[PDB]
Enzyme design. Structure first.
Site, PDB file in Angstrom:
ATOM      1  N   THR A 184     -16.265  14.106  21.798  1.00 35.48           N
ATOM      2  CA  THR A 184     -15.951  14.768  20.543  1.00 35.48           C
ATOM      3  C   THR A 184     -16.233  13.859  19.357  1.00 35.48           C
ATOM      4  O   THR A 184     -16.043  12.652  19.431  1.00 35.48           O
ATOM      5  CB  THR A 184     -14.475  15.242  20.524  1.00 35.48           C
ATOM      6  N   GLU A 258     -16.716  -1.399  31.431  1.00 37.68           N
ATOM      7  CA  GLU A 258     -17.950  -2.145  31.041  1.00 37.68           C
ATOM      8  C   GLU A 258     -17.708  -3.641  30.952  1.00 37.68           C
ATOM      9  O   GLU A 258     -18.539  -4.418  31.389  1.00 37.68           O
ATOM     10  CB  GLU A 258     -18.534  -1.707  29.697  1.00 37.68           C
TER      11      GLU A 258
HETATM   12  C1  HEM Z   1     -21.026  -5.060  27.337  1.00 36.13           C
HETATM   13  C2  HEM Z   1     -21.151  -4.336  26.008  1.00 36.13           C
HETATM   14  C3  HEM Z   1     -20.332  -4.581  24.991  1.00 36.13           C
HETATM   15  C4  HEM Z   1     -19.229  -5.644  25.003  1.00 36.13           C
HETATM   16  C5  HEM Z   1     -19.708  -6.878  25.183  1.00 36.13           C
HETATM   17  C6  HEM Z   1     -20.673  -3.721  23.858  1.00 36.13           C
HETATM   18  C7  HEM Z   1     -20.061  -3.799  22.650  1.00 36.13           C
HETATM   19  C8  HEM Z   1     -20.171  -2.977  21.566  1.00 36.13           C
HETATM   20  C9  HEM Z   1     -19.513  -3.123  20.253  1.00 36.13           C
HETATM   21  C10 HEM Z   1     -18.623  -4.321  19.843  1.00 36.13           C
HETATM   22  C11 HEM Z   1     -19.858  -2.037  19.515  1.00 36.13           C
HETATM   23  C12 HEM Z   1     -19.542  -1.635  18.076  1.00 36.13           C
HETATM   24  C13 HEM Z   1     -18.555  -2.200  17.372  1.00 36.13           C
HETATM   25  C14 HEM Z   1     -20.727  -1.246  20.329  1.00 36.13           C
HETATM   26  C15 HEM Z   1     -21.276  -0.084  19.968  1.00 36.13           C
HETATM   27  C16 HEM Z   1     -22.091   0.642  20.766  1.00 36.13           C
HETATM   28  N1  HEM Z   1     -22.722   0.211  21.897  1.00 36.13           N
HETATM   29 FE1  HEM Z   1     -22.284  -1.396  23.080  1.00 36.13          FE
HETATM   30  N2  HEM Z   1     -21.745  -2.926  24.241  1.00 36.13           N
HETATM   31  C17 HEM Z   1     -22.045  -3.276  25.565  1.00 36.13           C
HETATM   32  C18 HEM Z   1     -23.023  -2.658  26.257  1.00 36.13           C
HETATM   33  C19 HEM Z   1     -23.611  -1.477  25.846  1.00 36.13           C
HETATM   34  C20 HEM Z   1     -24.547  -0.658  26.634  1.00 36.13           C
HETATM   35  C21 HEM Z   1     -25.006  -1.039  28.043  1.00 36.13           C
HETATM   36  C22 HEM Z   1     -24.932   0.405  25.917  1.00 36.13           C
HETATM   37  C23 HEM Z   1     -25.956   1.475  26.401  1.00 36.13           C
HETATM   38  C24 HEM Z   1     -27.233   1.453  25.556  1.00 36.13           C
HETATM   39  C25 HEM Z   1     -28.283   2.433  25.993  1.00 36.13           C
HETATM   40  O1  HEM Z   1     -28.923   3.061  25.144  1.00 36.13           O
HETATM   41  O2  HEM Z   1     -28.498   2.652  27.195  1.00 36.13           O
HETATM   42  C26 HEM Z   1     -24.222   0.290  24.635  1.00 36.13           C
HETATM   43  C27 HEM Z   1     -24.295   1.150  23.558  1.00 36.13           C
HETATM   44  C28 HEM Z   1     -23.506   1.224  22.403  1.00 36.13           C
HETATM   45  C29 HEM Z   1     -23.365   2.420  21.554  1.00 36.13           C
HETATM   46  C30 HEM Z   1     -24.026   3.840  21.671  1.00 36.13           C
HETATM   47  C31 HEM Z   1     -23.132   4.827  22.408  1.00 36.13           C
HETATM   48  C32 HEM Z   1     -23.818   6.141  22.651  1.00 36.13           C
HETATM   49  O3  HEM Z   1     -23.747   7.046  21.793  1.00 36.13           O
HETATM   50  O4  HEM Z   1     -24.426   6.329  23.715  1.00 36.13           O
HETATM   51  C33 HEM Z   1     -22.416   1.986  20.469  1.00 36.13           C
HETATM   52  C34 HEM Z   1     -21.931   2.784  19.263  1.00 36.13           C
HETATM   53  N3  HEM Z   1     -23.421  -0.856  24.630  1.00 36.13           N
HETATM   54  N4  HEM Z   1     -20.920  -1.812  21.566  1.00 36.13           N
HETATM   55 CA   LIG Z   2     -13.562  11.521  20.003  1.00 33.21          CA
END
Ligand code: HEM
Ligand SMILES: [Ca+2]
Ligand SMILES: *[C@@H]1O[C@H](CO)[C@@H](O[C@@H]2O[C@H](CO)[C@@H](O[C@@H]3O[C@H](CO)[C@@H](O[C@H]4O[C@H](CO)[C@@H](O)[C@H](O)[C@@H]4O)[C@H](O)[C@@H]3O)[C@H](O)[C@H]2NC(C)=O)[C@H](O)[C@H]1NC(C)=O
Ligand SMILES: *[C@@H]1O[C@H](CO)[C@@H](O[C@@H]2O[C@H](CO)[C@@H](O[C@H]3O[C@H](CO)[C@@H](O)[C@H](O)[C@@H]3O)[C@H](O)[C@H]2NC(C)=O)[C@H](O)[C@H]1NC(C)=O
Ligand SMILES: *[C@@H]1O[C@H](CO)[C@@H](O[C@@H]2O[C@H](CO)[C@@H](O)[C@H](O)[C@H]2NC(C)=O)[C@H](O)[C@H]1NC(C)=O
Ligand SMILES: *[C@@H]1O[C@H](CO)[C@@H](O[C@@H]2O[C@H](CO)[C@@H](O)[C@H](O)[C@H]2NC(C)=O)[C@H](O)[C@H]1NC(C)=O
Ligand SMILES: [C-]#N
Length: 595
Positions: A184, A258
């Protein structure tokens, strides 16, 4: 004049228009257009998608096809040339705790999820892609450039599957491709409660009328609760240590396990729900299970929104805060509450905020044991570290005592995330979060850097020197031109993050705008915003206004000394006061008498 209503949503909808409670799917918020903001819909599009064939094939897909006359640079090369660094020393943020980074990741998961393709359980396509790097259909490999140490020990490429799109999932044809958001849009703790009906139930303990959430039965943290285990076999959490055999946690959002530090914060939120629910039963004996559930759930949502808008955002946006997010004036039904497609790349700025190690502390906030500090990569999908080695206490003190990593134009993303990322699907600690982000902008059909600068009314630089003035960095600007030939082709992710930070904030002018806009939109368009008249009572709000993350920690863990402003850098013990001096959540305004 194309169709205006296609899809593969969550079915049987029927709105109550009288319920004082949000639905699980996000459906029915907006009374006039009930699906606006719900889970499983296309993410929104602030600007037209930009694809190779103008419909679905990402840029970089067809070799002979340029983006504005130039070849788009390999994701992993943009990664190796610009994003990585060796020296971890001096990288920390002098005035942002490790909690600053972690809370961003929740809000985020509360707001958006773009699941990968799914026509593959009993698959040969997961190996057709893994093994021979053949790009095709939903396999969009991140090839390794020449001179990448990874060619020598990992292979020729990294698996990368295209995100899911909207009306079906099997190879589409008509309009421009639109990615699904599986959660959401509203800030409603959907990460603690699930976005599907089907899940929002399993997570509950309907074995009794106390309206609690289901906790685990196999392991306890000093009389306090842990999250239930996930039954699905595969486990990635099991994989990282086949001797401990501890599955990943079961929660409202699938990304919970994660990272040891993200699963912990989840634990705090589950505990607060169960906690709110018993304090409530004890004051309203007559209330049934569904009511303790919905009322506790409505309180936690108020929580997430208050810390996010009162404590978190003011320090990301900094001086840009009042330009995009004006003082709240009420529920606007003409406001589109949906998460835009670019937001999901703009919020990724947090990746440059993750520190290289994670620390555990004992009661006095000193190192907890001989191996208290651990490399970040060993913590991905690591649940056994929490269960067979200390509980969530030593880890929450670290959240408060340690700092976040400071974005730096010369030190963007830690190797821990750049070369040793663990993907829940495959077996190694050798992925590149940065290349994945870059390859993902292309997957989503994202417009280039200058389209967004234009979207936000900022100067669009078309020359090396122009780019130098914007980024205020000659060498960075110079490397960018070399790989992209024109700032028009700079991918929004590395595009928005290379800009210097605004006054008192943590993001540049471009990200502040994309960020600020989206956040002004989910608040004004939420019929259930905590401040929107009639959602809570004048007396209730007086109580909610006192929430603090410090209190959350005090009431759901055994820490007794916590900072009064958790998001800033707090040195122990000057800055640490006793839980007795942190405002408690007065639940008295929630009492109820029938007559
Ligand atoms: C391990 C991972 C994290 C912790 C070490 C981590 C951290 C963050 C922070 C601190 C974010 C914003 C304040 C944030 C935002 C978004 N992330 Fe990330 N992230 C880790 C690992 C991943 C992985 C793997 C993905 C997948 C990427 C892909 O395209 O395959 C990832 C994404 C995102 C994401 C997009 C979510 C979505 O709409 O699919 C954030 C907004 N992170 N992360
Ligand atoms: Ca939500
Ligand atoms: C709820 O949210 C709505 C959606 O965002 C808001 O409505 C928008 O705001 C106004 C309606 O009041 C619409 O236009 C604005 O107001 C004028 C047009 O009516 C413009 O002023 C001047 O603009 C040009 C300058 O280029 C002048 O030359 C012209 O003479 C005019 O006087 C404003 O610049 C602006 O366009 C706007 O289109 C609405 N947009 C949408 C998408 O609905 C509204 O603020 C909110 N409602 C309430 C009650 O607060
Ligand atoms: C996989 O998880 C194992 C636990 O599930 C882990 O082993 C555990 O960790 C160490 C052994 O390396 C021991 O912990 C310390 O504390 C005990 C008791 O105080 C001391 O006797 C030891 O000196 C030690 O320093 C645990 O006892 C041990 N437990 C078990 C059952 O093995 C492994 O390290 C993990 N493996 C990997 C590769 O991560
Ligand atoms: C660390 O961050 C805090 C939070 O911004 C700084 O203090 C705040 O400064 C703002 C100015 O924008 C004031 O409105 C508030 O009075 C402060 N907020 C709080 C909660 O104290 C603090 O000064 C920063 N430290 C440094 C060295 O910049
Ligand atoms: C559902 O709630 C009940 C209690 O309402 C949980 O069972 C209790 O919790 C512990 C763990 O076994 C013990 O104190 C007792 O066995 C139970 N007490 C009571 C009063 O019944 C049960 O574990 C919960 N179910 C889930 C899945 O969390
Ligand atoms: C990011 N999760």
């Amino acid at each position: 004049s194309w169709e205006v209503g296609c899809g593969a949503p969550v079915p049987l909808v029927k709105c109550d228009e009288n319920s004082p409670y949000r639905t699980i799917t996000g459906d029915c918020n907006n009374r006039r257009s009930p699906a606006l903001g719900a889970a499983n819909r296309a993410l929104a599009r602030w600007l037209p998608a930009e694809y190779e064939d103008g419909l679905a094939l990402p840029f970089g897909w067809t070799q002979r096809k340029t983006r504005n006359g130039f070849r788009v640079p390999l994701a992993r090369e943009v990664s190796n040339k610009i994003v990585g660094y060796l020296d971890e020393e001096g990288v920390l943020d002098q005035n942002r705790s490790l909690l600053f980074m972690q809370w961003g990741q929740i809000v985020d998961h509360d707001l958006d999820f773009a699941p990968e393709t799914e026509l593959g359980s009993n698959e040969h396509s997961k190996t057709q892609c893994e093994e021979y790097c053949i790009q095709g259909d939903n396999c969009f490999p991140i090839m390794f450039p020449k001179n990448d140490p990874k060619l020598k020990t990992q292979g020729k490429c990294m698996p990368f599957f295209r995100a899911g799109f909207v009306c079906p999932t099997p190879p589409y044809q008509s309009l421009a491709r639109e990615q699904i958001n599986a959660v959401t849009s509203f800030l409603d703790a959907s990460l603690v409660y699930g976005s599907e009906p089907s899940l929002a139930s399993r997570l509950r303990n309907l074995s009794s009328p106390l309206g609690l959430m289901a906790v685990n039965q196999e392991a306890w943290d000093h009389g306090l609760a842990y999250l239930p285990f996930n039954n699905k076999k595969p486990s990635p959490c099991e994989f990282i240590n086949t001797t401990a055999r501890v599955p990943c946690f079961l929660a409202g959002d699938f990304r919970a396990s994660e990272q040891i530090l993200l699963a912990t914060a989840h634990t705090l939120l589950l505990r607060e729900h169960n906690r709110l629910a018993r304090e409530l039963k004890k004051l309203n004996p007559h209330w049934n299970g569904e009511k303790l559930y919905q009322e506790a759930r409505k309180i936690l949502g108020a929580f997430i929104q208050i810390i996010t808008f009162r404590d978190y955002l003011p320090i990301v946006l900094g001086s840009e805060m009042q330009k995009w997010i004006p003082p709240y004036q009420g529920y606007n039904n003409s406001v589109d509450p949906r998460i835009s497609n670019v937001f999901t790349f703009a919020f990724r700025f947090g990746h440059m905020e993750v520190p290289s190690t994670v620390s555990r502390l004992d009661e006095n906030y000193q190192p907890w044991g001989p191996e208290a500090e651990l490399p970040l990569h060993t913590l991905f999908f690591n649940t056994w570290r929490i269960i067979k080695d200390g509980g969530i206490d030593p880890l929450t003190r670290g959240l408060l005592a340690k700092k976040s990593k400071l974005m730096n134009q010369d030190k963007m993303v830690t190797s821990e995330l750049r070369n040793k990322l663990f993907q829940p699907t495959h077996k190694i600690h050798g992925f590149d979060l940065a290349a994945i982000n870059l390859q993902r902008c292309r997957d989503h059909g994202m417009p280039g850097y200058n389209s967004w600068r234009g979207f936000c009314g900022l100067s669009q630089p078309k020359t090396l020197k122009g780019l130098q003035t914007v980024l205020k960095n000659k060498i960075l600007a110079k490397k960018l031109m070399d790989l992209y030939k024109t700032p028009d082709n700079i991918d929004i992710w590395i595009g928005g993050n290379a800009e210097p930070m605004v006054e008192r904030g943590r993001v540049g002018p471009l990200l502040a705008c994309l960020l600020g806009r989206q956040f002004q939109q989910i608040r004004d368009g939420d019929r259930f915003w905590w401040e929107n008249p009639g959602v809570f009572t004048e007396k209730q709000r007086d109580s909610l206004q006192k929430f603090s993350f410090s209190r959350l920690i005090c009431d759901n863990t055994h820490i007794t000394k916590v900072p009064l402003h958790a998001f800033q850098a707090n040195n122990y013990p000057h800055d640490f006061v006793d839980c007795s001096t942190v405002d408690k959540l007065d639940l008295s305004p929630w009492a109820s008498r029938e007559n």
